[PDB]
Design a protein around this ligand. Structure first.
Ligand SMILES: Nc1ncnc2c1ncn2[C@@H]1O[C@H](COP(=O)(O)OP(=O)(O)OP(=O)(O)O)[C@@H](O)[C@H]1O
Ligand SMILES: Nc1ncnc2c1ncn2[C@@H]1O[C@H](COP(=O)(O)OP(=O)(O)OP(=O)(O)O)[C@@H](O)[C@H]1O
Ligand SMILES: [Mg+2]
Ligand SMILES: [Mg+2]
Lengths: 55, 55, 55, 55
């Protein structure tokens, strides 16, 4: 998911690093469901806000 | 603008009626410059309307 | 996408869809999953005035 | 591979939406290398699609 969405957004590792512990937090808190869609949106939002913040 | 070529996405809104949910669309389309079009679907039931016939 | 009339698949990924329902319950879940929700919220009087006094 | 000749079957996965049902098939077709196809039948109500017409 992470490499895919990052390629989709054109961001880069070392420009938008996410510690795995952060991811553990994101899943522990914000998405707790059988699918892997809802989480997909969370981690895309996580990119896009940073992307606007940088660009 | 960051990743060059244009892209498209799908998303939705919800709140009390009359809050401006529909007014914003036309301004947005004139902002991004995509062509506007709307067509209310509510109460429709014919799938063929959105998929045509066998020709 | 595959219209019955013209069977050849029609890519339309670049389009920027939008959808507008005022209550996020009636939508069947599998479909409801596809589209991120965003809650527009009701206005407070102090600035409802100042918009109406401007527009 | 054991019996020699190739031979087909019918299968049906089922589970919660977004678990990957639609995205896995394409990889399967690429794996066995038999050519891919796809055929949504959501809501269709016309037998001709499966049976053509009398000429
Ligand atoms: N933030 C806003 N700015 C400007 N106009 C607004 C705003 N909110 C509501 N309006 C006014 O509300 C009127 C209709 O808005 P709109 O149709 O978008 O409401 P709505 O939620 O779409 O209602 P419905 O979906 O039931 O039509 C417009 O005339 C618009 O000027
Ligand atoms: N086993 C898996 N390995 C990698 N990715 C997966 C897997 N399962 C699901 N996904 C992710 O799910 C997404 C699409 O899943 P898919 O569309 O098959 O869900 P689905 O069950 O078909 O949902 P629905 O049937 O409601 O459309 C892809 O982005 C894919 O990466
Ligand atoms: Mg409206
Ligand atoms: Mg699917």
């Amino acid at each position: 998911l992470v490499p895919q969405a990052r390629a989709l957004c054109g961001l880069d590792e070392s420009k938008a690093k996410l510690s795995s512990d952060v991811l553990t937090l994101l899943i522990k808190q914000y998405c707790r469901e059988s699918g892997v869609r809802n989480l997909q949106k969370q981690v895309e939002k996580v990119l896009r806000k940073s992307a606007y913040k940088i660009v | 603008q960051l990743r060059g070529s244009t892209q498209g996405k799908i998303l939705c809104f919800y709140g009390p009626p009359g809050v401006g949910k529909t007014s914003i669309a036309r301004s947005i389309a004139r902002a991004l410059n995509r062509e506007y079009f709307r067509f209310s679907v509510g109460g429709m039931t014919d799938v063929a309307e959105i998929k045509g016939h066998r020709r | 996408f595959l219209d019955h009339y013209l069977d050849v698949p029609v890519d339309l990924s670049k389009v920027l869809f939008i959808c507008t329902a005022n209550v996020t319950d009636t939508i069947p879940e599998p479909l409801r999953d596809r589209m991120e929700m965003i809650n527009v919220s009701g206005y407070v009087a102090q600035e409802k005035l100042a918009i109406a006094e401007r527009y």
